Amino acid sequence: NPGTVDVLHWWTSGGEAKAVETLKQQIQKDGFIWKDNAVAGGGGAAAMTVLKTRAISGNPPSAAQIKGPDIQEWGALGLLTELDDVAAANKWDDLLPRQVADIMKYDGHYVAVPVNIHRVNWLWINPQVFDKAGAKVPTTLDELFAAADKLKAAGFIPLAHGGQPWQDSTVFEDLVLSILGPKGYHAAFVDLDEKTLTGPQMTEAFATLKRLGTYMDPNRAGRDWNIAAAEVINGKAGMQIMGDWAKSEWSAAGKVAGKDYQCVAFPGTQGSFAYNIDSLAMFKLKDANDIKAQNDLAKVALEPEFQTVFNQNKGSLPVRQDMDMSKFDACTQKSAADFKEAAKGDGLQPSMAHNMATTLAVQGAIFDVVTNFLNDPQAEPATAVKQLNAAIKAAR
Numbered sequence: 001n002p003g004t005v006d007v008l009h010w011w012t013s014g015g016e017a018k019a020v021e022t023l024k025q026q027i028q029k030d031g032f033i034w035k036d037n038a039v040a041g042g043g044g045a046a047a048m049t050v051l052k053t054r055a056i057s058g059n060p061p062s063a064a065q066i067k068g069p070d071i072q073e074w075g076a077l078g079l080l081t082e083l084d085d086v087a088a089a090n091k092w093d094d095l096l097p098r099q100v101a102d103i104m105k106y107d108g109h110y111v112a113v114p115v116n117i118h119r120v121n122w123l124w125i126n127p128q129v130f131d132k133a134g135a136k137v138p139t140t141l142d143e144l145f146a147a148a149d150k151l152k153a154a155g156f157i158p159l160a161h162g163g164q165p166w167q168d169s170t171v172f173e174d175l176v177l178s179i180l181g182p183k184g185y186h187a188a189f190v191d192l193d194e195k196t197l198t199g200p201q202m203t204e205a206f207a208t209l210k211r212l213g214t215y216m217d218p219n220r221a222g223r224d225w226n227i228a229a230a231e232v233i234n235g236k237a238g239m240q241i242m243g244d245w246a247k248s249e250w251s252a253a254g255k256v257a258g259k260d261y262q263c264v265a266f267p268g269t270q271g272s273f274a275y276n277i278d279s280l281a282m283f284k285l286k287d288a289n290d291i292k293a294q295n296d297l298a299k300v301a302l303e304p305e306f307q308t309v310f311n312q313n314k315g316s317l318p319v320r321q322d323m324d325m326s327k328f329d330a331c332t333q334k335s336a337a338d339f340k341e342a343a344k345g346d347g348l349q350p351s352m353a354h355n356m357a358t359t360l361a362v363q364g365a366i367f368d369v370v371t372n373f374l375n376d377p378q379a380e381p382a383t384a385v386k387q388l389n390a391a392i393k394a395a396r
């Protein structure tokens, strides 16, 4: 046995699978065995359940898709391996933005390797559906509702949305970023500031979320994010509020920007970039050949060729800084420009819904408040903000 790579991840949709296939291929070309542990469940909760079993099993995966502050917990447990030598040889501190490199370190040592930078705060449009409905691509919340009114009148699903908590909170966080702005967003989700969490603007975010719910399919419970994307691709819906992993579904269907889809910053979030960094935390392994395979995985993750093909298929930006951005599609080039702009000011903000801003316990509290609210058409925004602050406090 040359050594086996076992990555625990949740890349299972048609688009996500095309991306992870590029990793499988490179590992095989490098002469190692690929043994997949893909665990289906958008946003990763199902994967995390499997991980919690496997991690203290004595047979951990080579790596697992573990993001944000949660990397600190796995590092604190002593389960991850330090990557000093591979990081030095492959110049990771030079290749990675400082903001990103810090997330990957436990007590100053790399313990995880990033593969991308997803943008969460996108809105996906089907321009052909917009043309049929006489609708205008929205740049403001008011325009978003105007477009939704027209799509509805035209007999389309205005907003294709799946009723799962992480999806609900993806929409909610877009609203918070839009209404509060990036500094307010940071105060609420990173600093967990009580006055922000319970303020009039957060209250208005909940009122806006409730209205948005009136423009979704009432029987959307359980609908996977790729199902929602398909409604837009197939011309049944006008819009989807989702990160740029949605682009992977458009690309996998052979669709092109302008003609088939557009993406625009979520209305009112122009200038802000809510980032989601997929990273592979590397577990301490026992088997010598599997350690060699793991070291190969760590090398591959930031190789220029892999950074290109993975991210072309995945819908995200590459995380490596020296890349020829002209090799990506127009939407990814827009993402790059928007990242650069955001990074100059205070616009670059970690996604709460995608595990970058908070611990998982705090995220879970927020998810519960937001679905409970959106599940109840009669719910009150003033109560929601009190529950939001209270539940966050109890989760810590």
Ligand SMILES: OC[C@H]1O[C@@H](O)[C@H](O)[C@@H](O)[C@@H]1O
Binding pocket: 010, 016, 041, 042, 043, 044, 118, 225, 245, 276, 277, 278, 354
């Ligand atoms: O499953 C949908 C998306 O969930 C996000 O949390 C992950 O970071 C993405 O890689 C994935 O495509």
